[PDB]
């Protein structure tokens, strides 16, 4: 709904050239912890509307981007501000913890 669906080719304009904070979830359908956090991202997107944009990159349909960031495992969340990584988080976490993680960087 409010989650931007990324591609290797949309990444630059959607993430690097965007205004304000962007959380990007690197994920894949066969990744258990990834599916575990998928619904929390939908809720975060609605809730932080105006302060943050939430976005997903499926690494199977889009194999280009992950390596540019030295991503080793999934899920990995990168928080972008003004085209640079501000913070990252590897592996699953709760909704509550994700709010803590974002408040720490916004």
UniProtKB/Swiss-Prot annotation:
The active site is at residues 31, 34. GO terms for molecular function: DNA polymerase processivity factor activity; protein-disulfide reductase activity. Keywords: Acetylation, Disulfide bond, Electron transport, Host-virus interaction, Redox-active center, Transport. Residues 1-106 form the Thioredoxin domain. Disulfide bonds join 31-34. InterPro entries: Thioredoxin, Thioredoxin-like_sf, Thioredoxin_CS, Thioredoxin_domain. The keyword Ribonucleoprotein does not apply. NCBIfam families: PRK09381.1, thioredoxin. Participates in various redox reactions through the reversible oxidation of its active center dithiol to a disulfide and catalyzes dithiol-disulfide exchange reactions. This is Thioredoxin 1. It comes from Escherichia coli (strain K12). The lineage of its organism: Bacteria, Pseudomonadati, Pseudomonadota, Gammaproteobacteria, Enterobacterales. The gene is trxA.
């Amino acid at each position: 709904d409010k989650i931007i669906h990324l591609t290797d080719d949309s990444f630059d304009t959607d993430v690097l050239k965007a205004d304000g904070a962007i959380l990007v979830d690197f994920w894949a359908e066969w990744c258990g912890p990834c599916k575990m956090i998928a619904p929390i991202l939908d809720e975060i997107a609605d809730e932080y509307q105006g302060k943050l944009t939430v976005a997903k990159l499926n690494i199977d349909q889009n194999p280009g981007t992950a390596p540019k960031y030295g991503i080793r495992s999934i899920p990995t969340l990168l928080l972008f501000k003004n085209g640079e990584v501000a913070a990252t988080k590897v592996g699953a976490l709760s909704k509550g913890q994700l709010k803590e993680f974002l408040d720490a960087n916004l």
